[PDB]
């Protein structure tokens, strides 16, 4: 699989430091794992930094000049972004991209992105509440049940059902950002109403940023 594996993102206090890594996978070294691009939630793509070779040279956006340093271990084809004196407005998804030149410049391969959050608020693990199947809202031969994943920071959170066994009928809704600065989301599964007595329903919630893991059994009443 031709890909760029990112790491080193996460939550940092204002004024803090992160080192992003971008490891090339499935292709040979050609000095092209060479660009960092970021995207604030809701906003456009903002180019941050690039590196040239074989003679090393760093290029930087005005907004990061002096605070960020691009480098690459050529022998391990790993691109780095050292980020010092991180500001609130540096909060964004950071993509590394393979930068190439034919006639002109283009970025033909992007990492999946890593969320950098710059905030004085510390991480908070979710409270997980069962959304019980209702004794009337049982839509004839089906019932809705789910889990409320309440009051966590920052994103992301993962929800599975019955340890990955249950995928059909599952709808995990995008999170709401509450005024409190904490996220909530709901995961609902539509299931046969005959199975409610017999079949067990467990929502498995994982909040990596707070190292929080909750299994919540969802039963009627």
């Amino acid at each position: 699989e031709v890909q760029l594996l990112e790491s080193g993102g996460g939550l940092v206090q204002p004024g803090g430091s992160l080192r992003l890594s971008c490891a090339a996978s499935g292709f040979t070294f050609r000095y092209e794992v060479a660009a960092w691009v970021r995207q604030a939630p809701g906003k456009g793509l903002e180019w941050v930094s690039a590196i040239s070779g074989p003679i090393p040279k760093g290029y930087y956006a005005d907004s990061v000049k002096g605070r960020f340093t691009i480098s690459r271990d050529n022998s391990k084809n790993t691109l780095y972004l050292q980020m010092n004196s991180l500001r609130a407005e540096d909060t964004a998804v950071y993509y590394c991209a393979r930068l190439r030149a034919d006639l002109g410049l283009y970025m033909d391969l992007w990492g999946r992105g890593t969320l950098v959050t710059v905030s004085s608020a510390s991480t908070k693990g979710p409270s997980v509440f069962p959304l019980a199947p209702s004794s009337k809202s049982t839509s004839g031969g089906t019932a809705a049940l789910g889990c409320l994943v309440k009051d966590y920071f920052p994103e992301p959170v993962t929800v599975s059902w019955n340890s990955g066994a249950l995928t059909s009928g599952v709808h995990t809704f995008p999170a709401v950002l509450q005024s409190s600065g904490l996220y909530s989301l709901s995961s609902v599964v539509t299931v046969p109403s005959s199975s409610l007595g017999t079949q067990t329903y467990i929502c498995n919630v994982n909040h990596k940023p707070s190292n929080t893991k909750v299994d919540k059994r969802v039963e009627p009443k």
Binding site: V37, W47, M107, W110, L177, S186, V188
Partner: protein
């Protein structure tokens, strides 16, 4: 953003659309333009590089041109799959920056309208034990992707403690949203019922829940 694109464009399936990208001599004037497709909550994907060249796997119906300090992305045979944010990119020799357009949101129109499915959940015993109460109103399978939400305590409107998400495209190309009402356990207990009313293209779908104690 240093390059200027229209915020949004739209057309019905099978038709064609153009997305302009406006710049200056130091960027588009003297350098090659790339176009990036971004689907919601995923990494950008290269469609077009060197003004007009398609990346491997990208079909002919996607085309790019450049004229002076402007670039154009053309999309024919419009599919619902083509709904995405489109960004032009180039080099700016004045600032020595890679630069981007602000992005253009492409909408595919004339898809069949559908009213929202609403499921309303009352507060869990467990949450009430924690001296909290959240009503969860879950709204799915509506098109176009816009709804208004109104919460009632018995018959009377309630504005306070409402948190609603923006609509988001599901995997079946219809939209989903959630609304949460925060209450005290005392507020939840003191009323006969609470309602989530969802209005979509002039029709209201309502769900009601009551304290079962």
């Amino acid at each position: 953003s240093v390059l200027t694109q229209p915020p949004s464009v739209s057309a019905a399936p099978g038709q064609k659309v153009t997305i302009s990208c406006s710049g200056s001599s130091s960027n588009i004037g003297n350098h090659y333009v790339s176009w990036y497709q971004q689907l919601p909550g995923t990494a950008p994907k290269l469609l077009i590089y060197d003004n007009s060249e398609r990346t491997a796997g990208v079909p002919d119906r996607f085309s790019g041109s450049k004229s002076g300090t402007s670039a154009t992305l053309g999309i024919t045979g419009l599919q619902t799959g083509d709904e995405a944010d489109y960004y032009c990119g180039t080099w700016d020799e004045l600032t020595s920056n890679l630069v981007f357009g602000g992005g253009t949101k492409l909408t595919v129109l004339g898809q069949p309208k559908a009213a929202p499915s609403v499921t309303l959940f009352p507060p869990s015993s467990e949450e009430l034990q924690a001296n909290k109460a959240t009503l969860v109103c879950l709204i799915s399978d509506f098109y176009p992707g816009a709804v208004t939400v109104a919460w009632k305590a018995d018959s009377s409107p309630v504005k306070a403690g409402v948190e609603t998400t923006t609509p988001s495209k599901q995997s079946n190309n219809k939209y989903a949203a959630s609304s949460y009402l925060s209450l005290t356990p005392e507020q939840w207990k003191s009323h006969r019922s609470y309602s989530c009313q969802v209005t979509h293209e002039g029709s209201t779908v309502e769900k009601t829940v009551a304290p079962t104690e």
